[PDB]
Amino acid sequence: VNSFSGYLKLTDNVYIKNADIVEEAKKVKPTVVVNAANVYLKHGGGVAGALNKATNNAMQVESDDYIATNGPLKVGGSCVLSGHNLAKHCLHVVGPNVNKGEDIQLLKSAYENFNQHEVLLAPLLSAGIFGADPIHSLRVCVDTVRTNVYLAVFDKNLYDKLVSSFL
Numbered sequence: 490v491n492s493f494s495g496y497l498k499l500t501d502n503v504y505i506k507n508a509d510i511v512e513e514a515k516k517v518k519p520t521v522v523v524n525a526a527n528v529y530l531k532h533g534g535g536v537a538g539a540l541n542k543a544t545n546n547a548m549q550v551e552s553d554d555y556i557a558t559n560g561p562l563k564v565g566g567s568c569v570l571s572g573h574n575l576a577k578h579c580l581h582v583v584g585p586n587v588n589k590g591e592d593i594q595l596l597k598s599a600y601e602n603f604n605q606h607e608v609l610l611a612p613l614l615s616a617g618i619f620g621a622d623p624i625h626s627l628r629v630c631v632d633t634v635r636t637n638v639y640l641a642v643f644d645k646n647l648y649d650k651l652v653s654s655f656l
């Protein structure tokens with residue numbers, strides 16, 4: 490039993506809700522919140538910019554130190570950093586950016602990072618400003634993640650479409 494509320498169950502291990510991941514994180518304070526990061530951990534907009542804003546830029550400060558030490562992430566890769574006032578931890582995951590010419594096959598690799606955590610609050614990777622199809626992304630999530638994932642879908646129209654076409 491966990492403190493997530495109002496989610497639809499999609500499969501044995503995937504749950505979805507029409508919600509802003511930032512608001513879900515503030516309310517639930519989960520163990521792991523996923524960020525839809527880029528390789529530079531430059532949290533400008535979308536999921537990342539909104540999460541970072543909610544941390545009063547502490548996420549960006551921590552991220553800049555991480556990059557100065559370790560260099561950029563790989564597309565498809567991740568790192569675990571603090572969750573600040575939103576969660577215990579933040580799993581920064583880089584999906585491929587199709588508007589950069591990056592291979593959509595790396596989306597499966599991106600979701601594989603979720604399997605290192607028993608329970609996560611997450612967005613749909615590569616959706617939004619990353620340019621990918623959110624229905625394809627939801628299917629990759631369902632077919633890749635085996636741990637318990639609670640998906641927050643920001644756009645109501647998209648949520649309705651994902652749920653109705655899922656079977």
Ligand SMILES: OC[C@@H]1C[C@@H]2CCC[C@@H]2N1c1ncnc2[nH]ccc12
Pocket residue numbers: 508509510511525535536539612613614615616617618641642643644
């Ligand atoms: O797939 C990520 C979706 C696509 C949307 C268009 C751009 C970013 C948006 N995303 C969000 N998803 C969940 N919570 C969110 N809070 C703020 C943004 C946001």
